[PDB]
Amino acid sequence: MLLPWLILIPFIGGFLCWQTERFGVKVPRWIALITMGLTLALSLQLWLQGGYSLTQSAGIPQWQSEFDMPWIPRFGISIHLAIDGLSLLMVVLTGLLGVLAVLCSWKEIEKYQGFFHLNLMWILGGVIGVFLAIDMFLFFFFWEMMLVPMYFLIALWGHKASDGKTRITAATKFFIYTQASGLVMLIAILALVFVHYNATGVWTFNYEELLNTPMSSGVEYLLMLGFFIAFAVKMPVVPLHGWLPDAHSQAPTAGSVDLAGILLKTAAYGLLRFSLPLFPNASAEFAPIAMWLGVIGIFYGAWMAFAQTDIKRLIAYTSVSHMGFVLIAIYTGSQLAYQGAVIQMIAHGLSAAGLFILCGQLYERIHTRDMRMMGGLWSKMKWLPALSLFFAVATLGMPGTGNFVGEFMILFGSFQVVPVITVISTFGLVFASVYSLAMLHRAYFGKAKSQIASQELPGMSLRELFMILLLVVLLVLLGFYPQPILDTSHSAIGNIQQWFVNSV
Amino acid sequence: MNMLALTIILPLIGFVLLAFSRGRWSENVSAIVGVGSVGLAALVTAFIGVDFFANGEQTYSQPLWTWMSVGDFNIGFNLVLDGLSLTMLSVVTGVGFLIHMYASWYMRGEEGYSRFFAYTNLFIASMVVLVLADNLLLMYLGWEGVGLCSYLLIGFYYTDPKNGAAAMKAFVVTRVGDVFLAFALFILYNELGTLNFREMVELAPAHFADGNNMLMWATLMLLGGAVGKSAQLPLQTWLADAMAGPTPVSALIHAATMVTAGVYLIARTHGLFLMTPEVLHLVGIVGAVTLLLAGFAALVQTDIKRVLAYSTMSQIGYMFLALGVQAWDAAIFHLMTHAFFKALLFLASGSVILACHHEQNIFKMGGLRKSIPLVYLCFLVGGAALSALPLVTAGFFSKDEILAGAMANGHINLMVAGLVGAFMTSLYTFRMIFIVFHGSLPLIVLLILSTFVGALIVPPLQGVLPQTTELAHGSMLTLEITSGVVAVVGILLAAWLWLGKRTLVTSIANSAPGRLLGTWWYNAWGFDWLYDKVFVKPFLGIAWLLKRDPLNSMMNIPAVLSRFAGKGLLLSENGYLRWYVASMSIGAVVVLALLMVL
Ligand SMILES: CCCCCCCCCCCCCCCCCC(=O)OC[C@H](COP(=O)(O)OCCN)OC(=O)CCCCCCCCCCCCCCCCC
Ligand SMILES: CCCCCCCCCCCCCCCCCC(=O)OC[C@H](COP(=O)(O)OCCN)OC(=O)CCCCCCCCCCCCCCCCC
């Protein structure tokens, strides 16, 4: 009953951000902050009232909250939202990253800031809708709906240093990748709906009805392949990853579009929620290919991140490697590795948010993202290189940060299932330490390699310092006390794992 | 006793305060915060030791919270204190406190003074976590913290890029070690369902009764992690290159924190290694080979610091040799005494560097015994303890316990390698002493602690580690006099070769086999070269191969095919009406023929 408002408050807030722009040019940021704080507070209230710690695994479906409303009754399509532990964690993460995105673009006093804030809130509402929708058509609708404001933000509000054509090209590549993969997923959804309609005789796009769908081996594999192609584009899984570094490099320079658009892992959630329960046998036969795609993603992303001369491109390829770890975790059928995947999703969101916000502030300071021009910046800045050192320390899987908890619980469960893939992935963790040290030494240590880095740079403001230190505190608390997060998602992960291993 | 968590909390508070101070405080306040944080850690350790001895040396467990809990995967944030943990905690806190006040005197007038003390406080906290953990995952947290603090402190002078390269090499090699340790953790949890040291020791013989293969794999991976942290074969290349940091960080790394974690890890999981005797013998062999190679490498170094680094590698090899011959008390005793005299030697070498206007080549030095007598005395007694001079140094008693433990267990070749290494360590230590020096409260405390007074301290390892098999009295006395004779003979050979005019040394160093062997041992037997052309160069080659993102281009192929096909199809739209009529006729022919054939 609060889930429709969880989606609607961002949309109404974006509309009010556009409308209240005429009242003043400093008004839309306040409106976006109020509605993002309201969405975060509603998700936190759902967390407090859900009682997820004392929830046992009763089998799929098991929702802590559920809303249903008829939308297109001809096809049996409904606005069907449902929240449980995993979805709740993703929604709270989306709200926190949305508040961070609003605070990140606070100093934008441009003439059309209301449209920027409307696009931001529409992206955030679409992401929350992806995390909440259990009607398959509604899930696909939110999935493809959140890409239009993403496209326009990248194309029109993006990186000022690049020319217009490069931003248009990056936005077009991102849109083509995501929407073509989404259309393949829509083909799979439609074919599953028609298989169920031939088996029973009724139209349904409901997740719970489509779970009990008898399919032949081979049809189920093809539906699984369509779902996985969509999720692999948005994860990213190699080779469907090329859109991501150009989308990050041409995103708006503050970083809010990286936080709102990319750093929320809807594809790993979709693999856990849909690909594994709807097609458990096909996922069981796809597990070796998906595991080796994850291994290649880890190592390819590490090598790409090391070879970047752009710091934002480096952070994008770090995201590719970490999602390779999560992809290995998802296809393993182990509760421990699934819980590690949840922790890794949250921790990667927090650490990549910190890295991208710090990179945006650094670009504001020195007006270049090329690491061949910045050097020895530890002596020039007051706070930024130390916090960047902390976040690069987190991204290599440092104990005391949640990244270590996620990565190592993934590796423990995966070794219990697949040992060879696990040992190769731990050597991938060595590769992660390599690229993090390389970024740190090329940026902030050594001697100045140009003239802009040779002079004193202004200190970080109280708002930037506050949001970065909040991310630091959250990552440290996740590293040292991950038990509330593990208890929140324990029942949902248990249901998904039991469904996956009881049907194979 | 219940203040066991204060030994972690106080260095953590010191690091947090000194990091967030950002150099705004004065050097007196920063020195007070850092040195006093480690000093209160040492005082709490002294009270903990008094309470531990006051109730019969009972093992005390202090759990704080549960770190992770997923099903059967239960990892606790607990601390445990027994005799081995008390020994390691006492040496870490006390020697770190002495090094901290020496660094407070030493690092005056330097940028990052508070940053230096924040990083050393975090180093102390990480090592206390490492030595005070009852399960392997919390010990892994302390392991990684110690490695990260080592990386931060080695490249402390971040302006010079070579210090940063040394720090990166140290972190990468030790991270390969941590990957081996992670493999050990994965195997041990998959087989036994627990990572608590006592619990795996209890449950291992029942579980591995039918088959004992994964226990050998787990102990081999534990040994790999240990040799990564302790700079042994084959992960020893980082130590000499990465001792390019400031002097107190080298004293902390080589004496208290970094290199003793592998020894503590093998000693802590001694039951699992006892169940796999071949891996324990491999631990001994790795220690013997490492000590021999390190002694030969230290014999030809041209800097005081690199001589001390390869000496640290040799002494850790002695500790690994003691662990491999089931001489655990000897290994921990040598750990403690080596912490004492190696901290003293590194602090004295730092005073040498400060007084010698930043000079490090030993041949450009000479006759420094008259410029400063106290530093020469510190170097003399630290070298005597390093060379195991009989009856006046603690290192003699420690190395003699190691050799007696190797003798009593039927190990002949390891004892022979230990005696050869003892001769070699007298040789290289007093080669450095005679080249450099011929031709104050921390220093005082380490001065007395490096003599037999340090050997008067007995670590309370009864009931933690198994008792070593006792040697016969005549055999023990013959081993004693043989070790003393070997050390004195090495002393006299170094005096004959380097004190006067080096005619025989220069004649055999300039020969072609002499030059070949000198340039081989100077580069530490070419392991840096081998790892550069086996791991570094293909990594950089693959990076330069992949910097174009070939998979992105492979997925951009369909867009290029789309442009090509569209431009080809646009040629048909030439604008000519008769061609449009002809194309309608062509399509009619095609449609009609297709309908006729089907
Ligand atoms: C896992 C693989 C198997 C499953 C694949 C499932 C399909 C969906 C998921 C993968 C999507 C891959 C999309 C590849 C193209 C992505 C878009 C792109 O690269 O656009 C480049 C370019 C825009 O750049 P711009 O600078 O504007 O152009 C220069 C001026 N004309 O664009 C252009 O200039 C024109 C672009 C036109 C549209 C691109 C062609 C798409 C054709 C359908 C491909 C379907 C997949 C084929 C098999 C996989 C690839 C081998
Ligand atoms: C179980 C016990 C522990 C066992 C071992 C654990 C090991 C893992 C520890 C992980 C934590 C991060 C470690 C690395 C921190 C690197 C950053 C740092 O310390 O930078 C130093 C810098 C001060 O240097 P200075 O040169 O004076 O600065 C002036 C101009 N920059 O500092 C600054 O400029 C300001 C501070 C920057 C950020 C400092 C680190 C923040 C994270 C730790 C504290 C988090 C807050 C505490 C509460 C958490 C929630 C309860």
Side-chain angles (χ1 to χ4, degrees), chain A, chain B residues 1-209 211-469 471-598:
Chain A
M1 255 312 158
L2 288 160
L3 323 171
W5 299 114
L6 266 192
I7 308 176
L8 274 170
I9 285 163
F11 291 156
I12 300 170
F15 182 75
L16 286 183
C17 280
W18 171 33
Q19 282 320 297
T20 50
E21 175 174 10
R22 302 142 171 142
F23 282 146
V25 86
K26 304 181 173 179
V27 193
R29 45 177 206 189
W30 280 98
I31 303 296
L33 193 58
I34 292 150
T35 88
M36 266 333 305
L38 263 157
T39 313
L40 182 63
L42 214 82
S43 62
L44 286 182
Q45 186 225 0
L46 266 163
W47 199 355
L48 281 165
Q49 81 190 19
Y52 298 90
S53 178
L54 285 321
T55 301
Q56 252 42 69
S57 288
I60 298 181
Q62 182 180 353
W63 309 111
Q64 257 55 62
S65 193
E66 210 177 353
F67 171 83
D68 210 340
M69 172 175 163
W71 183 20
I72 308 159
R74 190 253 174 277
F75 296 111
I77 292 176
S78 309
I79 304 165
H80 202 169
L81 318 171
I83 209 176
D84 83 328
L86 171 69
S87 315
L88 181 270
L89 280 178
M90 290 333 281
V91 157
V92 170
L93 179 61
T94 302
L96 163 75
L97 283 205
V99 170
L100 290 179
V102 175
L103 281 178
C104 201
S105 60
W106 195 257
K107 249 48 193 180
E108 307 274 308
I109 320 296
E110 271 105 314
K111 184 246 190 153
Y112 278 107
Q113 266 316 108
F115 282 127
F116 181 87
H117 285 299
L118 167 142
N119 278 21
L120 204 60
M121 302 300 105
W122 175 10
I123 287 160
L124 290 154
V127 169
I128 289 158
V130 162
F131 285 136
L132 288 184
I134 60 170
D135 187 275
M136 290 328 279
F137 188 79
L138 185 66
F139 172 75
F140 165 83
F141 202 88
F142 281 126
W143 188 268
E144 312 271 81
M145 173 218 288
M146 85 216 176
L147 315 165
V148 177
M150 258 317 268
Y151 175 87
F152 276 110
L153 280 191
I154 295 173
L156 303 172
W157 276 274
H159 198 53
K160 288 310 83 153
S162 311
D163 303 350
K165 187 231 153 73
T166 32
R167 285 187 311 175
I168 301 309
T169 297
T172 314
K173 183 184 190 179
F174 150 79
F175 206 99
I176 284 169
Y177 263 90
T178 45
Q179 171 90 21
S181 56
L183 281 186
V184 173
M185 177 177 60
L186 179 69
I187 293 318
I189 288 167
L190 273 168
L192 172 64
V193 162
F194 279 115
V195 162
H196 186 93
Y197 177 74
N198 297 340
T200 75
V202 86
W203 300 102
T204 170
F205 281 73
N206 194 14
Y207 169 62
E208 316 154 344
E209 253 62 65
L210 285 172
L211 278 150
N212 326 122
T213 302
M215 305 165 279
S216 63
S217 177
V219 171
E220 180 191 358
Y221 204 91
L222 284 162
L223 306 185
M224 173 291 291
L225 272 194
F227 266 85
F228 183 77
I229 274 159
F231 297 143
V233 155
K234 222 166 274 188
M235 175 83 111
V237 178
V238 283
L240 307 170
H241 75 284
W243 62 274
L244 185 106
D246 321 75
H248 270 310
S249 58
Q250 303 310 311
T253 86
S256 45
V257 179
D258 316 275
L259 320 181
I262 288 99
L263 299 186
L264 306 158
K265 311 275 78 204
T266 65
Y269 165 81
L271 280 174
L272 282 162
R273 175 74 78 214
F274 300 113
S275 296
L276 293 173
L278 293 164
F279 331 106
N281 309 113
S283 301
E285 339 304 330
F286 197 65
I289 308 178
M291 263 144 192
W292 282 111
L293 278 178
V295 163
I296 292 169
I298 289 171
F299 277 103
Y300 191 84
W303 263 310
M304 293 302 326
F306 178 75
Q308 288 337 286
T309 78
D310 195 290
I311 169 167
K312 202 127 181 232
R313 207 156 267 258
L314 194 145
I315 304 159
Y317 283 121
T318 67
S319 177
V320 172
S321 329
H322 303 153
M323 273 331 96
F325 270 109
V326 177
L327 181 73
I328 291 170
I330 283 169
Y331 275 88
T332 211
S334 160
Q335 171 96 11
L336 182 54
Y338 287 4
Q339 290 276 78
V342 175
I343 297 287
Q344 185 58 39
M345 284 153 75
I346 289 181
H348 162 264
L350 300 181
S351 69
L355 273 187
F356 276 128
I357 290 163
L358 283 163
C359 169
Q361 283 152 24
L362 180 63
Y363 177 74
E364 265 166 34
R365 259 60 173 187
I366 72 176
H367 320 292
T368 167
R369 286 197 202 269
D370 200 359
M371 275 174 309
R372 287 170 300 194
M373 296 240 293
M374 36 168 147
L377 285 179
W378 191 278
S379 46
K380 307 294 151 45
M381 314 191 62
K382 325 271 279 300
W383 285 92
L384 198 134
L387 300 153
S388 331
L389 160 60
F390 172 80
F391 276 107
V393 151
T395 54
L396 57 93
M398 194 57 207
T401 70
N403 299 262
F404 162 76
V405 177
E407 256 152 347
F408 258 60
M409 267 172 38
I410 285 171
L411 289 172
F412 267 111
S414 305
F415 191 85
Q416 279 198 320
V417 178
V418 283
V420 194
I421 284 135
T422 307
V423 304
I424 299 173
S425 317
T426 332
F427 283 109
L429 165 148
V430 154
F431 276 52
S433 100
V434 161
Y435 63 56
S436 288
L437 276 35
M439 176 213 99
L440 258 162
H441 276 42
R442 287 198 277 250
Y444 312 104
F445 297 139
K447 286 284 221 316
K449 285 169 280 187
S450 69
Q451 197 50 54
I452 179 61
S454 307
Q455 62 174 259
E456 192 87 6
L457 306 158
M460 255 162 58
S461 75
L462 256 301
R463 164 192 46 91
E464 296 145 350
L465 197 50
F466 155 75
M467 56 205 272
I468 288 299
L469 284 180
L470 164 74
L471 279 174
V472 168
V473 160
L474 285 175
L475 255 181
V476 166
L477 281 177
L478 188 55
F480 278 101
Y481 208 54
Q483 206 49 55
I485 313 294
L486 288 172
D487 293 343
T488 304
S489 67
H490 154 260
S491 175
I493 288 309
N495 286 334
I496 289 168
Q497 194 262 338
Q498 277 311 305
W499 191 280
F500 180 62
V501 308
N502 282 337
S503 326
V504 166
Chain B
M1 208 33 167
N2 50 335
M3 29 177 39
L4 193 67
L6 253 50
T7 54
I8 305 172
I9 286 164
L10 294 160
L12 260 194
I13 286 179
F15 153 73
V16 161
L17 286 177
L18 284 157
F20 276 104
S21 68
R22 285 194 297 119
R24 294 187 240 96
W25 303 342
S26 68
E27 273 179 324
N28 292 22
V29 182
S30 301
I32 279 175
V33 166
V35 179
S37 168
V38 192
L40 303 179
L43 246 175
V44 166
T45 310
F47 292 165
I48 274 159
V50 163
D51 196 314
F52 177 80
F53 281 118
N55 35 79
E57 304 176 8
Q58 280 302 110
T59 301
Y60 175 73
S61 301
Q62 191 196 18
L64 315 176
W65 66 88
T66 305
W67 198 8
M68 294 146 207
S69 180
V70 180
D72 285 327
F73 185 81
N74 199 292
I75 296 300
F77 215 108
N78 324 321
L79 319 179
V80 74
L81 178 92
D82 51 321
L84 177 54
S85 297
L86 184 74
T87 306
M88 293 288 312
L89 175 64
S90 55
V91 301
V92 157
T93 32
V95 178
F97 166 64
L98 295 167
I99 291 166
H100 267 74
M101 41 184 328
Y102 177 87
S104 77
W105 168 81
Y106 174 88
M107 302 276 309
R108 294 271 166 166
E110 293 262 23
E111 199 274 314
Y113 187 84
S114 49
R115 176 171 44 105
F116 182 84
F117 274 105
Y119 286 171
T120 55
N121 269 102
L122 198 58
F123 211 170
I124 293 301
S126 313
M127 188 86 195
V128 171
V129 168
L130 205 161
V131 304
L132 288 184
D134 46 309
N135 61 99
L136 261 176
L137 199 48
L138 193 48
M139 189 216 78
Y140 199 93
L141 175 131
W143 209 261
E144 304 313 280
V146 143
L148 177 66
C149 294
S150 149
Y151 152 80
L152 284 170
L153 278 158
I154 282 164
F156 177 75
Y157 301 133
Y158 59 92
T159 293
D160 190 343
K162 295 342 306 163
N163 304 148
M168 282 186 64
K169 184 220 248 210
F171 198 75
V172 163
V173 176
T174 52
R175 210 95 212 279
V176 177
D178 317 333
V179 171
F180 298 144
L181 186 56
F183 294 161
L185 261 72
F186 303 154
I187 296 175
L188 280 166
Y189 172 68
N190 186 40
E191 293 300 317
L192 309 170
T194 176
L195 291 184
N196 197 300
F197 292 117
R198 175 193 38 85
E199 291 196 40
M200 335 181 261
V201 162
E202 285 156 351
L203 300 172
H207 177 72
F208 291 104
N212 202 51
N213 204 39
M214 293 297 143
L215 194 51
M216 310 206 98
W217 274 111
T219 47
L220 187 61
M221 296 306 120
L222 279 168
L223 162 64
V227 302
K229 198 58 78 187
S230 267
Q232 301 284 283
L233 215 78
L235 299 182
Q236 85 292 335
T237 66
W238 65 272
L239 194 64
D241 203 46
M243 177 226 50
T247 286
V249 0
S250 293
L252 219 46
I253 273 173
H254 291 249
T257 53
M258 209 33 186
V259 296
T260 68
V263 192
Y264 169 72
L265 170 65
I266 304 299
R268 174 58 77 202
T269 67
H270 71 272
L272 314 171
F273 273 96
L274 273 177
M275 302 177 210
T276 61
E278 260 54 61
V279 193
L280 205 46
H281 202 39
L282 186 47
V283 171
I285 287 169
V286 155
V289 168
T290 316
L291 88 94
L292 283 183
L293 302 185
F296 274 136
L299 201 31
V300 296
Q301 297 307 296
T302 73
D303 324 305
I304 297 183
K305 270 204 125 187
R306 310 253 302 192
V307 159
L308 291 184
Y310 288 114
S311 79
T312 306
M313 190 184 299
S314 260
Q315 296 312 285
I316 297 297
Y318 270 105
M319 297 172 216
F320 268 56
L321 185 136
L323 294 159
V325 301
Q326 324 215 9
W328 321 90
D329 295 4
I332 306 306
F333 187 42
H334 195 49
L335 196 146
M336 171 192 72
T337 61
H338 164 258
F340 294 154
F341 70 75
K342 199 41 74 53
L344 166 71
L345 273 180
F346 261 108
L347 298 200
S349 81
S351 292
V352 155
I353 278 176
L354 271 201
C356 211
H357 56 270
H358 285 76
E359 179 49 64
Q360 279 129 313
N361 207 320
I362 60 166
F363 290 127
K364 279 191 277 174
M365 292 174 174
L368 271 89
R369 60 192 295 245
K370 310 117 172 21
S371 184
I372 166 66
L374 177 57
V375 152
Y376 174 57
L377 166 77
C378 291
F379 251 105
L380 255 191
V381 67
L386 184 45
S387 326
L389 212 66
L391 304 171
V392 286
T393 56
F396 167 71
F397 298 98
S398 317
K399 216 171 285 189
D400 256 34
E401 265 221 323
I402 292 182
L403 292 170
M407 176 85 284
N409 279 101
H411 294 98
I412 289 321
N413 306 127
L414 295 196
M415 193 219 48
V416 165
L419 286 173
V420 168
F423 174 74
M424 258 156 35
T425 193
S426 304
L427 226 55
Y428 67 67
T429 320
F430 273 69
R431 158 197 183 268
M432 185 212 43
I433 289 290
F434 292 150
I435 282 172
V436 167
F437 283 100
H438 289 260
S440 298
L441 183 269
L443 283 183
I444 285 302
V445 172
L446 297 171
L447 218 31
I448 293 101
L449 275 179
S450 305
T451 62
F452 53 89
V453 179
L456 294 181
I457 309 177
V458 175
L461 309 160
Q462 270 222 273
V464 171
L465 306 158
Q467 206 81 25
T468 331
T469 148
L471 206 46
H473 178 33
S475 190
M476 193 186 36
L477 254 287
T478 50
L479 199 42
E480 254 173 71
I481 66 176
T482 313
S483 301
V485 152
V486 153
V488 159
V489 153
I491 273 285
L492 292 214
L493 202 290
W496 188 69
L497 272 200
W498 284 285
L499 251 197
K501 260 310 315 163
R502 306 135 202 167
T503 56
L504 189 55
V505 162
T506 326
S507 69
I508 72 182
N510 288 356
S511 60
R515 206 91 48 110
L516 175 168
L517 283 182
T519 206
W520 192 22
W521 302 337
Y522 186 81
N523 294 124
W525 303 75
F527 275 95
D528 248 353
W529 177 89
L530 180 70
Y531 295 157
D532 198 281
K533 337 270 154 173
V534 155
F535 297 112
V536 174
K537 260 30 181 173
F539 182 87
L540 300 175
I542 291 174
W544 165 97
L545 227 56
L546 293 184
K547 81 177 151 21
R548 215 204 157 110
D549 208 341
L551 295 182
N552 188 35
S553 311
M554 180 249 261
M555 293 297 309
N556 283 17
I557 298 303
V560 180
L561 286 196
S562 300
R563 319 225 174 61
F564 188 62
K567 258 120 72 184
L569 286 163
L570 280 180
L571 281 180
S572 181
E573 304 263 358
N574 45 34
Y576 290 105
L577 181 55
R578 298 190 295 124
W579 159 241
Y580 293 172
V581 183
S583 80
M584 266 182 44
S585 318
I586 283 161
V589 165
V590 166
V591 160
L592 287 181
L594 277 181
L595 277 165
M596 285 312 112
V597 299
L598 330 171

